[PDB]
Amino acid sequence: SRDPASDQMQHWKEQRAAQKADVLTTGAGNPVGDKLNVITVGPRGPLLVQDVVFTDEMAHFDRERIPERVVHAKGAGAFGYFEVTHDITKYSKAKVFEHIGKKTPIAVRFSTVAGESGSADTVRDPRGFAVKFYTEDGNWDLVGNNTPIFFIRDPILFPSFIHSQKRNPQTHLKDPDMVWDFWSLRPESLHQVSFLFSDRGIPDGHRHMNGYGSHTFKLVNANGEAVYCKFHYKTDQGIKNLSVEDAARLSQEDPDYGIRDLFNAIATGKYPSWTFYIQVMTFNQAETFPFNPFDLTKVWPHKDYPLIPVGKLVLNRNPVNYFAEVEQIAFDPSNMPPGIEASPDKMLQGRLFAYPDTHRHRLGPNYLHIPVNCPYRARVANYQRDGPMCMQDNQGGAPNYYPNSFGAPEQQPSALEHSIQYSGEVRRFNTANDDNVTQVRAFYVNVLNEEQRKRLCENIAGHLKDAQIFIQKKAVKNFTEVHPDYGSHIQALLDKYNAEKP
Amino acid sequence: SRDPASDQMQHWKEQRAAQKADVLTTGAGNPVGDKLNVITVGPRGPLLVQDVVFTDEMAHFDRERIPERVVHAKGAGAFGYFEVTHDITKYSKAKVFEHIGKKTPIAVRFSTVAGESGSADTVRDPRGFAVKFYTEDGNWDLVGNNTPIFFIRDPILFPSFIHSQKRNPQTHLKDPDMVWDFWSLRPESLHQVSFLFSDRGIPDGHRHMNGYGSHTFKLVNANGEAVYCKFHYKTDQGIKNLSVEDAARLSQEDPDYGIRDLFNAIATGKYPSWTFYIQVMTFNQAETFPFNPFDLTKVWPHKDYPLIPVGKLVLNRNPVNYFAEVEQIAFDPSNMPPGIEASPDKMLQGRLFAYPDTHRHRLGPNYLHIPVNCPYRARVANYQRDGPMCMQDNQGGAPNYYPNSFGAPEQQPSALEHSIQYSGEVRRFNTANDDNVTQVRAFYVNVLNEEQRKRLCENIAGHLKDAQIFIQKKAVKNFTEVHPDYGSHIQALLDKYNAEKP
Amino acid sequence: SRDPASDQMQHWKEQRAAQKADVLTTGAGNPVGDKLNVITVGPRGPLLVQDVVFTDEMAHFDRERIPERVVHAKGAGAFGYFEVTHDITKYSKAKVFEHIGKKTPIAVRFSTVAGESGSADTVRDPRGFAVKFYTEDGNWDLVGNNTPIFFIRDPILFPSFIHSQKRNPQTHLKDPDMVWDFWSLRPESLHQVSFLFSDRGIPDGHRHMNGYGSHTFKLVNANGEAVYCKFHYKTDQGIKNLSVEDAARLSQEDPDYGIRDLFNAIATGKYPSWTFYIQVMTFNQAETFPFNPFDLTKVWPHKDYPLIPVGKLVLNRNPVNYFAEVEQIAFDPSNMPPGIEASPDKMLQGRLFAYPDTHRHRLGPNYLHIPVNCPYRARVANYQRDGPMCMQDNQGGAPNYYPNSFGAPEQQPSALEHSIQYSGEVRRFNTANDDNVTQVRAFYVNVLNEEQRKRLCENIAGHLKDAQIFIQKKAVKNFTEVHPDYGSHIQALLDKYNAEKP
Amino acid sequence: SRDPASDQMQHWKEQRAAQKADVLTTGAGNPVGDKLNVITVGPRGPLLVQDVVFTDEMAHFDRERIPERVVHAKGAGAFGYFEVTHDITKYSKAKVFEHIGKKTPIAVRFSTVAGESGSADTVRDPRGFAVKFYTEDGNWDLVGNNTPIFFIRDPILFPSFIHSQKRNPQTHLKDPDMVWDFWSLRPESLHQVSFLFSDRGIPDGHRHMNGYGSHTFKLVNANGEAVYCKFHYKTDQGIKNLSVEDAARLSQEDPDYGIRDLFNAIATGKYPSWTFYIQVMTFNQAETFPFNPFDLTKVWPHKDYPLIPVGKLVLNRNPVNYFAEVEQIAFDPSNMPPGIEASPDKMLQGRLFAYPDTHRHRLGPNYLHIPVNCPYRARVANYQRDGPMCMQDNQGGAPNYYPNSFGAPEQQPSALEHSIQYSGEVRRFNTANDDNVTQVRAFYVNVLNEEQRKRLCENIAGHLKDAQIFIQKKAVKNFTEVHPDYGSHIQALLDKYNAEKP
């Protein structure tokens, strides 16, 4: 007996036990006499069209692949539940938080950002930590990262950021000039670049990392009072990171390290958990916060905004079929039940549009009817009809226009969004020259020790050495603005690497 | 109270009765506070992206349409059953025929051929009469027409035939030159053109027409003995046709005449039935038949090949949702359970390829999992996985390769196809100059009376008058070869029409 | 010789003249020996897979259909130019208006709203009048109707409105209960319902109708000063309408009446033109306008806001291939060059999202590279890459992220949008009970004469008679609020129809 | 200055030189004022829908990914030419071979088989070596491998073979049980497994490997005389292989090793070439060949069937855009000009269907109009019309049905396929127990030396050690049947590995 992952097929055979093999059918349920040989004109003759077993099978094989996610393509999934352990109903009327001990089923997908489907798990990247909560008020998708911040604060830069992180459009090679040209020109990236090149840039699998919603959200209570919050889901297995050397070894030996680690943990009963916290900021505190509290390059310091515990995430179930439950799962940040709403974080606003839009391409118009995406603890009743691969009854003969005089579904005024007044012109406001260094300096000085600062600078220099000198210069200038020792330590390592380079 | 079709919504409201209206949700099951107004910056300001209710709804609306069927776009559907009334188990081991009184659920779609989705029902065209039998050996699709024959005997001509019958590629107008240039150049069309322009060219709705499989199929019994057969499903409501004048009136007044007629019949308990017959021809009779018995332009005369009764088709249920059950239904002639097989009819061979192929485009790779297409009285177990809009479990963790040592599904040797030897070179054989007139003459002389011959010639002349003279000449030449009176009567009417034409 | 439309193929043959027929090829340019017969095992044997001519052809045929437009499916197209005849550069810096006599190529598609692809042209409906201007500042799509107003003033009602106008979801029949339940519940529809049921509800083909942008747009001049405008394009062939009786006759005799009329006009040199006007309203006039000037159910009266002439639209070219140039053409109201911008008309704001969204489904992600949609008088240079059916070079090896240090395309600050301040909370504002009758009364009393009022009431009663009495009552109540004689005349006709009804 | 691949962007900037940056446009060619910031309601307000720059860009980004190839996903491409150096016009009338020194442009894609898009180049796998020849008789796709043979001889096993080589359907991990269960049950795989686990299982990039057509094809000369042939394209750079240790290192250090190697070779003028040979076998030799000459698990020994030189393949051009020219390129083995035809190799027959079928899914119906796939040295003229993303003119107003009387394209009887008679029943013939060992033994004994046999057995044992013992036993049994020393050496290494395993 090996690890449970290695024994998947042996275990499947054992569960079947005395059961006779199912009859092998075509897609249309017609039994197949022989699937090992095609119909030919005698033993050395050509293949006949009336071999429909062959064509049925081959035509399906020809269509197996769907587009990979534009980002976060390489992932691992698992199922479990969220349990409420504390009352936050003062902040949010959301049914998911309704009472202590209320259990909600969840689905999680962990991912890297830039790698395609066949890429290695144990690489330096932000990790995605997406959680789908199947509530009675519909699905809530908290599409988090393993970092509280991001590289950019305006969503129109997102495609450019991802392009710079992916392959050269001509050579199809990863390109340090592209990576560092973009970051050196957009110094709002320094905070997340500091996190990325620190030890938590390569977690030891998915169980040993935190998740964050990253954005400011808005909680609304039963009295219609709103606060702003951040969501934090801190690992109960403890933070653990791979060394650059072990990460490199594993990238070759076990490209699927994270998938295997998580599958084996859950298969052997070692159910990974995370403690779910919020930070709360009142609308008055948002007016007086030293930065933009809706700026995705900024945290809320823990002294001013302590973590309020809410509940626990537990993953206790592996997917039965990876394609059905992990490849096809879709998280939309716009899937927010009543009591949880978007802040005006510009990055969150962009994500409200982009995810349903990419889901309709990647999966199809009716992707919310794929079982893993279905809000199966809610009744879907609306005026939406048809579209390709329409499953179930398409809401039967129910009236398909609103308003109507025939008793079809009705708006629920309690589900109405929280209203705010906003001051200013409708236009494009520059946020490039918001504060790019203050919190990065707090991280470098107050959070990292001396050993950690040395590895941070070694990890950066090792990547940045491959960029052109003009890019190295602009990158080091930005690091120097954080702290002279940050910049100078990087420049010192670059001088060594650029000298070795013929 | 009006006809049941007109009262669809009133009846839906009545069934709901005391029930409170369902809560109006987004696709992800999140309740909607207000679906009558969008979120704006004050009462005369611009629309906000965070109006995801608006975007969810509008994005679905934007994707409602799927491609129409390349042919037979305009249709009416209904459900019911096939009941065996006689034993043909001597001819076929097919479970659908297994014992007297065995009931199998069916789905039927009636259609015209050339009209697009918004076109009129009461036009001159062949009608499609497609029957899906949900058997325990998987689905059997008998994709029949309201005529025993077709216009062509080689499938490589099918796209050309349909192009000639549809719109001019530049003007987007129906084009008599295209229609009659093609038919006049391909005189194998005379038999089906004679049927088309006779009284049965415009049935009085779907209940008053026969269906035919048209092709020769092969029945195989439990001893592995094969015969050839034709399938005939003769209306129990009796043949009834619209006059050209009534057909024209209805095309304007009731474009959906056939849909309405069928829906109202079933809603008022007038359940239309058809008697299901076979004709049988032994392999020896196939050697000695005066024509090619696999030629789709030929019938088997009833004196030599009498109708053997088998069962009854009954339609007793309307679709609950037209899009879900009629627009999305897919019939594949290649869906044949054991005991029923393709003959070497070249046209049937082409159809073995074309239908699954168009279904994967029109509906999607996984179109067999759409509920109306699902073989729900059979267990589908095979090595096919994934593809877009993968529903159910994608066969869970079952081994996905064959052969395997882990107890996944197994071929069933009893389901093996019937073997035949064929004589000749593998090449393209010309069938253009097979007999194009003998059976057409039998129809003109022995089956039509004098009144019927007059209307046949008036219906043809009225269409053919719009073609160029050179096409009229070639068309009349072919009609003359059937019978001098056929040709001369048409030429006489054309002389009258061409004289009136300035 | 017949009409030019009827002679399309004869004319094509004549242009070819002495030229030998092209060699018939597969899709991959391989010459075809025989396309009239398939490869079989001898003359009565089965079809071979190695017949790739057959499969290449059939597989293409299987994929011919794309989804029809969700609305405005049935259309006619033509090409020509817009010519400036007056200076409006005081109002707009748009290059399309730059100097007198400046010619810009245009594409136009005329359509009905509710009919599917095979439906009749000569039916009561609004007509679409979409104009694409191929300018040097990219395409400008003015996606107009043959009416200055619409049935609704909030875009979240659009899918419901279109559902109510299309087929019952169960029966697939047009449903007067659905049509009149929706209109009777949404009396903002009265203005466009009055226009719809008047004589201009059935134009005599496309050449004899006006087009309107319908929405308020914003013009911005070279000094950055903004006004609001309406666009009007008045027929130079004069308004002409079909009688209900002639419209009904033509629906049967010539379903493609509008396509044929337009094709024949342009083929015979009778080039239809429209005079292009604007109405202008200053930002101060917008503050003091008695209604919401951004309300799509309201006109700007001509006395207060006279038509300022701008130029002339001329259609002088037929499409060479209908599918390539009319079926595949896509108009996005969001395609606005500098000098032309969206007003805060809520309906226009909805249309900014919906059209690119439906285009990516109906045509594909890269639909702007389809030749008729390509901005071929502008250089497209940006950071967009890849997507299915990527044509041209995908911008070669150009840097694919912004900002960059490598000289790839740069933002043009002169192309920056006009900034405005808006007052109020971000929320859903009810507009149902805005004024629904004032301008409708002006139309009934001041614009229609006595004969026209009689036909208006006869046309409404003839449709509304089929709705349930409770709907008839609510409909008549709303008509009565416009004018007692409007309501009473309709009720009188209904009493007659409801008495005849058993 | 670095390697040319690293300098892609610097070189692009240099070519631009004094040229001003292009203006940044939307997809519709409208200039963009600012692409660095979105439109918001004041500086901390929500995002507006009328930010169409944002939506245009984001919507395109959302749709960038197309499905990866179902197999051979990870690839490198290049362009060049084929030059004829010898006369084989006695064997083939194909224009590509017409006269000595005739140059034909080519496109090549090199690939591994099982890896997804982000996987490492330097792994043990067969390599794809696909060549597209743009001839005047249309495209010829020679879709070859770096091995003359394959693992299976019946195409209905292909999906199972690829499934066994890819990820476990539940765990999404590579599974040695799946790999070796399949191979141990299908011992026809021994020949290609022996090649795979030998030194040529990991070439040193694409320039240092041979290509083979693998299948028997049929050459037909101007007199209509047919022979059978194999195509061989032997590297002029010489065979060179990575050691397992270097391959493992490079998999981590340079996942894109093969892409980089090839791009840098061509960028520095080191244009890789291959010598193109045929082996010829007459129809009489095919009758008397000791094996099935159409069996893809068998070679034609060089002594009996010497290599006849034909020409040279040269790659002298890199792709300008990888997505446009390498990701979107499609090779169909069915794209064969006159003079080259399919043999009855069952595997080739399956490939005649599968490639156009997967291309219509992966790329779209009109994938042959993507510039890299276009037969641009041939005139495409046929009766195929429409389909999504129809580019060019869709053949204008040409008649769209065949036959016609209007001078549209005509079949070319010289392009007719070669006719053969075949003996036997139309049925499924078992080929599992064809000879599985004779040629494998010739390889083990006569072609490998002692050092090579040792590495062969070490490479197999290192993979097979991870399979269950029952699979190891069945695998070793099959190796023993090749040669007792083959089996025993593997069993010896397994005993060592299975002892180390706790």
Query: How far does A224 lie from chain B, in Å, by closest CA?
Result: 13
* Rounded Cα distance, D227 and D339, in Å: 10
SS3 A76: strand
Q: Is A245 exposed, middle or buried (0-12, 13-18, 19+ CB in 10 A)?
A: exposed
- Residues D339/D93, Cβ–Cβ less than 8 Å: yes
Q: Is A405 on the interface with C (CB under 8 A)?
A: yes
Output the domain CATH number for residue B9. 4.10.91.20
Output the domain CATH number for residue B472. 1.20.1370.60
Which of C113, C252, C281 is the best substitution to test chain B (most B C-beta atoms within 10 A)? C252
Q: Is D5 exposed, middle or buried (0-12, 13-18, 19+ CB in 10 A)?
A: buried
Residues annotated in a binding site of C:
191, 198, 200, 210, 234, 300, 302-303, 355
Which of B10, B26, B385 is the best substitution to test chain A (most A C-beta atoms within 10 A)? B26
Within a domain: B431: no
Name the structure determination technique: cryo-EM
Residue A191 annotated as binding?
A: yes
Q: How many CA atoms lie within 13 A of B444 on its CB side?
A: 23
CB contact under 8 A, A21 and B412: no
Q: What's the Cα-to-Cα distance from B436 to each of B145, B191, C128, rounded to whole Å?
A: 20, 8, 48
CB atoms within 10 A of CB D201: 24
Return the beta strands (E) in B88-149 as ranges.
103-111, 128-135, 138-145
Here the tokens at position A440 are: 């990065």
- Residues C343/C228, Cβ–Cβ less than 8 Å: yes
C38 φ, ψ (degrees, to nearest 5): -90, 165
Q: Any residues with CB less than 8 A from the CB of D255 and at least 6 apart, and which?
A: A119, A120, D118, D119, D120, D121
- Residues C196/C326, Cβ–Cβ less than 8 Å: no
Query: How far does A266 lie from chain B, in Å, by closest CA?
Result: 16
Within a domain: C418: no
Kindly state whether residues C290 and C233 are assigned to the same domain.
yes
Q: Is D42 on the interface with B (CB under 8 A)?
A: no
- Across the interface, of D50, D59, D389, the residue whose CB is closest to C363 is D389
- Residues A170/D318, Cβ–Cβ less than 8 Å: yes
* Rounded Cα distance, D51 and A264, in Å: 47
C-alpha A76: how far from its chain's center? 11
Within a domain: D399: no
Candidates C145, C146, C373, C436; catalytic one: C145
Query: Could you tell me the sign of the dihedral formed by the alpha carbons of D381, D382, D386, D389, in that order?
Result: negative
Kindly state whether residues A288 and A238 are assigned to the same domain.
yes
Write b or e for each residue in D363-385: b if 16 or more Cβ atoms lie within 10 A of its Cβ, otherwise e: bbbbbbbbbbbbbebbebbbbbb
- Residues B402/A75, Cβ–Cβ less than 8 Å: no
Within a domain: C419: no
Kindly state whether residues D144 and D211 are assigned to the same domain.
yes
* Rounded Cα distance, B37 and C155, in Å: 8
CB contact under 8 A, D425 and B427: no
Within a domain: C414: no
Question: What DSSP string runs through B302-349?
Answer: TTTS--EEEEEEEEEE--SSHIIIIIS----TT---TTEEE-S-HHHH
Question: What DSSP string runs through C239-250?
Answer: --B--HHHHHHH
Strands D340-342 and D217-220: antiparallel
Cα angle D452, D457, D461 (rounded to 5 degrees) comes to: 150
Here the tokens at position C158 are: 């659009």
Provide the number of structural domains found in chain C: 3
Q: Is B440 exposed, middle or buried (0-12, 13-18, 19+ CB in 10 A)?
A: buried
Write b or e for each residue in B268-306: b if 16 or more Cβ atoms lie within 10 A of its Cβ, otherwise e: eeeebbbbbbbbbbeeeebeebeebbbbbbbbbeeeebe
Residues of D in contact with C395 (CB under 8 A): 321
- Residues B84/B123, Cβ–Cβ less than 8 Å: no
Q: Any residues with CB less than 8 A from the CB of D245 and at least 6 apart, and which?
A: none
Q: Examine the residue annotation and report whether B394 is marked as an active-site residue of this protein.
A: no
Q: What's the Cα-to-Cα distance from D465 to each of C491, D400, D457, D461, D462, rounded to whole Å?
A: 89, 61, 12, 6, 6
* Rounded Cα distance, A38 and C50, in Å: 14
- Residues A301/A353, Cβ–Cβ less than 8 Å: no
Q: How many CA atoms lie within 13 A of A198 on its CB side?
A: 22
- Residues D309/D229, Cβ–Cβ less than 8 Å: no
In this structure, the dihedral spanned by the alpha carbons of residues D338, D339, D345 and D346, taken in order and rounded to 10 degrees, is 10
- Residues C420/C458, Cβ–Cβ less than 8 Å: no
- Residues C311/C276, Cβ–Cβ less than 8 Å: yes
Of A256, D173, A318, A58, nearest in space to B396 by CA = A318
Instruction: Note down the domain range covering A45.
Output: 1-65
CB contact under 8 A, D31 and C57: no
The 3-class secondary structure across D110-159, one letter per residue, is EECCCCCCCCCCCCCCCCEEEEEEEECCEEEEEEEECCCCCCCCCHHHHH
CB atoms within 10 A of CB A412: 17
Q: Is C397 on the interface with D (CB under 8 A)?
A: yes
Using left for φ > 0, alpha for ψ between -120 and 50, and beta otherwise, residue A205 falls in left
CB contact under 8 A, D420 and B416: no
Return the beta strands (E) in D333-480 as ranges.
340-342, 420-421, 425-428
* Rounded Cα distance, D67 and B388, in Å: 10
Strands A420-421 and B217-220: unpaired
Question: What does the radius of gyration of chain D's CA atoms come to, in whole angstroms?
Answer: 26
Choosing from D374, D390, D420, the residue where a domain stops is: D374
Within a domain: D402: no
Write b or e for each residue in C92-117: b if 16 or more Cβ atoms lie within 10 A of its Cβ, otherwise e: bbbbbbbeeebebebbbbbbbbbbbb
CB contact under 8 A, C350 and B178: no
* Rounded Cα distance, A357 and A377, in Å: 24
Which of B2, B68, B171 is the best substitution to test chain C (most C C-beta atoms within 10 A)? B171
Of D111, C388, D75, D69, nearest in space to A65 by CA = D69
Kindly state whether residues D80 and D116 are assigned to the same domain.
yes
Choosing from A374, A398, A415, the residue where a domain stops is: A374
* Rounded Cα distance, D85 and D104, in Å: 12
Of D421, D420, D488, D423, nearest in space to D454 by CA = D488
In this complex, the chains that touch C, judged by 3 or more CB pairs closer than 8 A, are A, B, D
* Rounded Cα distance, C305 and C280, in Å: 7
Output the domain CATH number for residue A237. 2.40.180.10
Choosing from B65, B93, B113, the residue where a domain stops is: B65
CB contact under 8 A, C155 and B38: yes
Kindly state whether residues B255 and B361 are assigned to the same domain.
yes
Write b or e for each residue in A173-187: b if 16 or more Cβ atoms lie within 10 A of its Cβ, otherwise e: bbbbbbbbbbbbbbb
Here the tokens at position C339 are: 């000098």
Kindly state whether residues D263 and D325 are assigned to the same domain.
yes
Within a domain: A407: no
Kindly state whether residues B284 and B370 are assigned to the same domain.
yes
Within a domain: C41: yes
- Across the interface, of D168, D401, D424, the residue whose CB is closest to B164 is D401
Kindly state whether residues C311 and C269 are assigned to the same domain.
yes
Q: Is C446 exposed, middle or buried (0-12, 13-18, 19+ CB in 10 A)?
A: exposed
Query: How far does D191 lie from chain A, in Å, by closest CA?
Result: 19
Residue owning tokens 């219609």: A224
Q: What letter represents residue A96's amino acid?
A: V
* Rounded Cα distance, D427 and A51, in Å: 9
Kindly state whether residues C46 and C159 are assigned to the same domain.
no
Kindly state whether residues C55 and C74 are assigned to the same domain.
no
Residue owning tokens 């909030």: C154
* Rounded Cα distance, D442 and A86, in Å: 74
In chain B, the largest separation of any two C-alpha atoms, in whole Å, equals 86
Of A186, A165, A199, nearest in space to A72 by CA = A165
* Rounded Cα distance, B400 and B407, in Å: 11
Q: How many helices (H) and strands (E) does chain C have?
A: 14, 13
Kindly state whether residues B159 and B223 are assigned to the same domain.
no
Q: Is D43 on the interface with B (CB under 8 A)?
A: no
Helix axes B450-464, B176-185, angle to 10 degrees: 120
Q: Is B430 exposed, middle or buried (0-12, 13-18, 19+ CB in 10 A)?
A: exposed
- Residues C98/C84, Cβ–Cβ less than 8 Å: yes
Q: DSSP character for B411? A: -
Here the tokens at position D492 are: 């010896």
- Residues D50/C349, Cβ–Cβ less than 8 Å: yes
Q: Any residues with CB less than 8 A from the CB of A108 and at least 6 apart, and which?
A: A77, A78, A79, A80, A129, A130, A131, A132, A313, A315
* Rounded Cα distance, C165 and A215, in Å: 42
* Rounded Cα distance, B140 and A29, in Å: 9
Kindly state whether residues C183 and C253 are assigned to the same domain.
no
